[PDB]
Structures are given as structure tokens and as C-alpha cells.
């Protein structure tokens, strides 16, 4: 990344690189220059290929073999069991897209751009544009069905009760706030300010 | 495959050794700790009790496993050998990858 | 409702009531931590931003192809029509038309493929909504890591965000266990839970939470003599009826 | 142009866009804002529960396609039409 | 599904009547009116469109 | 160029099939290996053990 | 003789109050049969003599 540093490394794919004309390290995915090979292993930062990944040490670029994870051996015995004595609850976030932008394109203005003779020459090619417009309309119409089938699974609009006696649980960060004009929740508001075109 | 005339192939990120290590780790976890390691930290437990739990989930009482442990073990051992023999008989069950 | 949902994951409903405050505090801290983690960007929203970028880049690539030449003398149609006679302009108009039509066809095909991908993702999202939000899932890793309790949906500019609440065991201790207890020549098995020992005495405890009980005829059942079971131990069992019968004197 | 704007709200008949839909009054075309559904508030309390006392069984229908018509087109015959020189 | 297969098939059939810049959309007329060494340049432009 | 474009389109079509198969394989791994599926015919015929 | 067995494995037990529950009289249930049930408390009650 430019904001981190300016040092770069160059990879030549699929070349023995004895003929490629510092540090030169041979790799099964082709040798790379500007990197130092090390003994240690870490999680993959930048995938190179064939189990080799590169990362920034912090002031130099290094290449290493990937590490799958920490190794541990469970104490198996034929008369021993392990039982938990305490618990912790946790919250995780999962994100899924549901729809995309609806667009429509006309041939005549795109190809011909209001020219009359171009339109006369275009009509002898048949009905390509009827097919194209039908396909684009079919793409556009099914976008609304995707949003319709994910949400709107509840028939009636339930409202939150005025008193928040929920046994000590605090849902204020996810319940909607009537004061802010778009009537969204705090987290939902925080989400919309993070995505830009 | 072969490479020539402006087209090349690229090696995958994970080698076969790493995939084999992942499968071995999964197998060791599922034979030494049951389903516990999938939710959190692995908890060791003998295998006969785990077979008893799995029997109890399908609506069969756990007492019938202990009274028939040898028979079930023998049947499992015979089934594994039969599966090993079947693939060695050059049966074309691997068509999906070859296609 | 929390008491119901703990019963679904194989944990007795009582343990909620002695730990309600701790559970509520943990839930509030987890919500605050999710808020702080969402504030600190780590490319979590990349699954929407990449879709927006691939749509915009494809559209923009379609735009720049209008300036291509395709073998004509100039790409500006007005120059062609105002510079050459029609019978010689036609042999340029046709090739320009073919190039533009091919570009449009390629764009339409790419949009057709991307629409199917997005629709598959939307079907998965609807299935996950119906599964995790309106009920309590039993299939593992479908509504987050661990034993699923509930979920909450949130809106996104082109998607949906799920907040999964799960139950995770924290710290464990190990004990000596036995499959059955033999008393009076008869084998005993637990109705639920397993037999555990701290080295001197035997107890019955829950599946996923340490809570010992005295071995009693109430939570055990008998099936046959005990010589056949492998690894059986030799301990007594208590019956509550005998002290009551003795007190009837 | 040609639709009357009204205060009311109903389920969408013909989608227009941005929450606007059109329908036939039975005898003019009207335009209205979509109604998401009926509104009610549940009587929540910290010591109140509701238990059903009766039940009704129902049958629903769902339809799914499994296949489509098998077709085949001969490339040479379609393009050329049994033409030696064209072939 | 039935309609969207039928319309695609019908549109495929109808495309055979297009001209594609040739002097005639019927190939028999092309090879019955013209001498082949200048008729191939008429046949190819139908071939590409089809 | 037309040949290359046809090849690219065919690869793009096949990639979706490969991805769908991979997603099904991952779901089956998670449900049948890391737990005991209560769901019929998803992890083999009969009642699933492990 | 009548017994109680599991869903998927034959293992007949003696019908006992411990593995059965009572609800309503037997006039409404269609197909009910006429058989006795065992109560384990009576021998223990007799033991106090
Ligand atoms: C189980 O874990 C909880 C937290 O996960 C423990 O509760 C904390 O205990 C420490 C010990 O003094 C206190 O300082 C904290 O205030 C407690 N609460 C929190 C939210 O951290 C608890 O002690 C553990 N053990 C048992 C038996 O519950
Ligand atoms: C529970 O519902 C059933 C039907 O949903 C009720 O049965 C009906 O009761 C009315 C009362 O006069 C009769 O006219 C109908 O003939 C009954 N049958 C049907 C099919 O409608 C029943 O009364 C309700 N209550 C109880 C306690 O069962
Ligand atoms: C650049 O890196 C620094 C140090 O990691 C960081 O504080 C900063 O936010 C990054 N971005 C910019 C725009 O400076
Ligand atoms: C690169 O070329 C040299 C000289 O031909 C050869 O000795 C060497 O083995 C080659 N590298 C590899 C990885 O084969
Ligand atoms: C990595 O360790 C091996 C011994 O296992 C050694 O021979 C090699 O020199 C080490 N690599 C570096 C860069 O020091
Ligand atoms: C819920 O949390 C917010 C933010 O910390 C706080 O302002 C509010 O008072 C809390 N609700 C209750 C009932 O304590
Ligand atoms: C319990 O676990 C520890 C940690 O692996 C192990 O050393 C010990 O042998 C186990 N058993 C007992 C009885 O402590
Ligand atoms: C085991 O638990 C019992 C419970 O009363 C206790 O009396 C005994 O001392 C414990 N033994 C050990 C070794 O902790
Ligand atoms: C396994 O169990 C048997 C009895 O079932 C016991 O004799 C043996 O010592 C156990 N194995 C170990 C390593 O203790
Ligand atoms: C179990 O205890 C009984 C009590 O009399 C004894 O007869 C039997 O031999 C014991 N069995 C074992 C394996 O210790
Ligand atoms: C809807 O009602 C408001 C007053 O509540 C009124 O001002 C407005 O004109 C009405 N809309 C139409 C289309 O008449
Ligand atoms: C069905 O059961 C009834 C009693 O519930 C009995 O009278 C009748 O004979 C049975 N049907 C047949 C075909 O035996
Ligand atoms: C069942 O047995 C009781 C016992 O006397 C008798 O009164 C009753 O009539 C019997 N019913 C049938 C259907 O045999």
C-alpha cells in the first residue's frame, strides 16, 4: 500500500529466471525479487501461490511458507471426560447482498444517436434490440422480487411497547429512534454512511 | 497440462499436502472430541460414550450399544473393508471429477 | 423466552435464573463491542462495495467503447455523414454499427450472468432470514459459530445484515467418568447426563454445564445384569422411599 | 398523466416505482402510496402470557418446475439450407 | 417457462428472414442470379449473421 | 477474437456450476462432519450417525 | 400379554405407572382395550407390617 510504504516486489510467473536479466528467491510459481526468504511461518497476508505468501515485516518485504494454525494435542483417554463450568455469549455479524442497480439501455440512441440513415441501415439486422431490451427488462423486474421475498415475510406491522422492561436487556442500539428523520436505528444509520458510490 | 502459444496455467494457493493436513486435523478432532470442537474448545471423551450419544439422538436408548458393542464394531470394520475393496475394483464411481 | 431458548440447546432452564444479570451484562457488552468493531473498518462491508464497483466499472467500460474507431476514418458519426457521400459512407456505417452492437451484446451477457449470481445470493439470504429470525436453528454453523439462540436483522443499502447471538462454553475441568453403575447385580444408566467423579464420590451432571447431583433411582433406569457392560464401576445408589418408610414408624 | 392522486393506501396492484402503485377503482385509474400491512400493538407485560385453546389444520399448495422441453437444432441445415457451395 | 422458451424459439425462426445487407434474404436467389466468384461475398454476410 | 470470446463465455458459465457444487460441499461438510444432522437423506440413506 | 417397547427396537417392558400417564376416562378414545396395569407401591406398603 502507498500509505504504508513505497517499497515494492516484482514476481515473474512461470519462469526459471536464470535469463530474467539484490535478492532473488526461486519459487514454484516463478521467482520473485525484492523479497527475503525467512524460516518462520505466519498467516497469509498476500497470496503469491504454491503455499507461499508475502507480508510487510515492520521496513522490509519477506516471503514465507503458510502456517495452517496452532498445533495442539487433546488428552484422549478411555476413562476421562471434560465438562465446561462457565459460559460466555457472543454476537457475530454476517453480511449478504440481495439486489443490484436496475439499468435500461436503448439501442437506437446508443448505436445511431438520432441519425436517420443509421436507423435505416440498422433495421435490416432483424430483432437484436428487441431481444436486448427484453433481457434487460427481465433482469430489472426480478430485482424487486429479490427484495420482496427476503423482507416482507411478516403479514402485520408490530410496534414496540412504550415501556422497555425486558428483564435487563438493552435493545436501544437496534430499535428505531423516532427523533432522527429517516426513522432508522443507530446501527442502520452507521451502515448507510459507510457505503459510497 | 501443457503451456504454449500465449496461454498458461497457474498453480493453486493450497498444495495437496495442506489439504491432506486439514482433512487429518478434522478427522482427529471428530474422532477424539465429537461435535464439541465445532462449537468451541475441544473436549476429550471416549468413543464408546460418543457412539452412545449418537444412538440416543436417533430415538434408540443408549443401553443397547453397550450390550452390542462388539457386534457394532465388527460390522463397522467389515463395512470399511468392503468400501476399500469396492474402489480398488476399478469401478467408475469417480466419473464426476473425470468429467 | 431465554429460558425456552436455553432448553432447545440441551441446557436446563434453571441456570438462566441464577445468572440473568451476568447474561444481560454480557449481551450489552457484546452489542457495544459490535458497534465499536463496525465503527473500526476492516473491509467488512466489502461484499457490497465490490458489487457496486463491478456494476459501475462494467457500465463505464461500455461508455468508453463509443469512442472506438472499428476501422472507420473517424468515430464521430456526424463527421462521416457530413463529409462523405451516402454510397461511400455506408461501407463505414456498417462496420461501426457491427462494433457497437457486439459491445452491447457482451455487456448484456455479463449482466445476465451477474443477475443469476445475485439472485442465488438473495435466495440464500431469504432462507437464512426465515431460518434464524423466525425460529431457532439446529443445523450447525447456519446462524453463526456455536449454539444458536436468536438473530436480529438490519438493513443495508443493497443487502441485509444479521446479528447472531450464540452460546459458547468458556472454561472446563476434567474428571473420571464411567458408562454405568452396578448395584445389587443390576446395571444402571442415566436418564440424561453422565456419571462423573472427583476422585472419591460419583455424581450425575448435565451435558454442557457442571452441576452435580446425587445418584438416585429417580434419574436412573435399570436394564439387565451388569456383567456384560464393559468398564462398569462398583458403587451404590440411593432410594428416597426408604427414609420416608422408616419415618412412618 | 391520466391518473388521480388519492389520500388512501392499499396493496399494490400495478407497480410504478418509489412506493407508488396504480389500480382501477371500479371506474377511474388512481395512484396511491403502498400500504405495508395492518398495524397493531401487542399487549406486552412482564408477567402476562397467552396460551391457545383451539386449533385448525390447513392445506397449502406450492408449485415448482423440474424440466423444460428438449430441442435440437442442426447448425449446417439452419445456416445454409442443404447448400453445397454454402457448406 | 413454457412461454419464454416458445418466444425464444419463434424469434430464432424469424431471424432467418433478415437481409444482413445482402441483395436478397433467399440463398437460392443469390446462387441462381449471380456468378459464384462474386456471389460468395454475398453468401458470407448472410452466414455471419445467421 | 470471436473464438476467444466464446471460450471466455463458456468458462464463465461453467464457473457458476463449480461454485454451486463447492457451496453444497461446504454445507454438507459443516452439517454432517461437525455435528449430527437430523435431516433425512442429506448425509446418506438411513439415520445419520457421523 | 401386553408390553411397552421402544420405537425402533423391540425390548418389551412390563406396563407400569412409571412409564405411563393418565388423562381422562376411557369412553372417548376409539380402540381402547381392557387390561390391567401394575403399581409398584403396593409391595412396599405391604412391607410395613
Ligand atoms: C464465569 O465468567 C464470568 C464472566 O465471563 C465471571 O464473572 C466475572 O467474574 C469476575 C471475577 O471477580 C468479576 O470481577 C467480574 O465482574 C464478573 N463479571 C464480568 C462480566 O466479568 C464469573 O466469575 C465466572 N465464574 C462463574 C462461576 O460464574
Ligand atoms: C374449536 O374449533 C372447532 C372448529 O374450528 C369448533 O367446532 C365447531 O363448533 C361449532 C360450535 O357451534 C359447531 O357449530 C361446528 O359444527 C363445530 N365444527 C366445525 C368443523 O366447525 C369447536 O367448538 C371449538 N372449540 C372446542 C373446545 O373444540
Ligand atoms: C496511513 O497509515 C497510518 C499509520 O498506520 C494511519 O494512521 C493512517 O490512518 C493511514 N491512512 C492515511 C490516509 O494516512
Ligand atoms: C534453471 O536453469 C538451469 C540451467 O539450465 C538448471 O540447471 C535449473 O535446474 C533450472 N531450474 C529449475 C528449477 O529447474
Ligand atoms: C531455515 O532453516 C533451515 C534448517 O531447518 C536452514 O538450513 C535454513 O538456512 C534456514 N533459512 C534461513 C533463511 O536461514
Ligand atoms: C441502554 O444503553 C444506552 C447507551 O449506553 C443508555 O443510554 C440507556 O440508558 C440504556 N438503557 C437502560 C434501560 O439502561
Ligand atoms: C486434565 O487436563 C490436564 C491438561 O491437559 C492434564 O494434564 C490432566 O492429566 C488431565 N486430568 C486430570 C485428572 O487432571
Ligand atoms: C468430592 O466431592 C465431595 C462432595 O461432598 C467432597 O466431600 C470430597 O471432599 C471431594 N473430593 C475431592 C478429592 O475433591
Ligand atoms: C482402558 O480401559 C480398560 C478397562 O476397560 C483399563 O483396564 C485400561 O487401563 C484403560 N486404558 C488405560 C490406558 O488406562
Ligand atoms: C462389586 O461389588 C460386589 C459386592 O459384593 C462384589 O461381589 C464384586 O466382586 C465387585 N466387583 C468388582 C469388579 O469389584
Ligand atoms: C391528502 O390529505 C391532505 C390533508 O391530510 C391534503 O392536504 C391532500 O390534498 C390530500 N391529498 C389529495 C391527493 O387530495
Ligand atoms: C377396525 O377397528 C375396529 C375397532 O376399532 C374393528 O371393529 C374393525 O374390525 C377393524 N377393521 C378391520 C378391517 O378389522
Ligand atoms: C372392561 O372391563 C370392565 C371391568 O368390569 C367392564 O366393566 C367393562 O364392561 C369392560 N369393557 C369392555 C369393552 O369389555
Residue numbers in the entry:
A (entry chain A): 601 to 621, 640 to 676, 690 to 828
B (entry chain G): 852 to 950
C (entry chain A): 901 to 1149
D (entry chain C): 651 to 676, 690 to 750
E (entry chain C): 951 to 1000
F (entry chain G): 1001 to 1050
G (entry chain G): 1101 to 1149
Copy text from the publication:
To examine the mode of binding of Ab 2-7 to SARS-CoV-2 spike, we initiated structural studies by electron microscopy (EM).
We also determined a structure of this variant in the absence of any ligands to facilitate comparison with the scFv-bound structures (3.0 Å). A Cryo-EM reconstruction of unbound S-D614G with one RBD in the up conformation (3.0 Å). The inset at the top right shows that Ab 2-7 would clash with the “down” RBD of the neighboring spike protomer (green cryo-EM reconstruction, filtered to 6 Å). The D614G mutation has been found to increase stability of the D614G spike, which allows for increased binding of nearly all constructs tested. Superposition with the apo-spike structure reveals that Ab 2-7 scFv would clash with the RBD of the neighboring spike protomer if it were in the down-conformation and therefore cannot fully engage its binding epitope until at least two RBDs are in the up conformation.
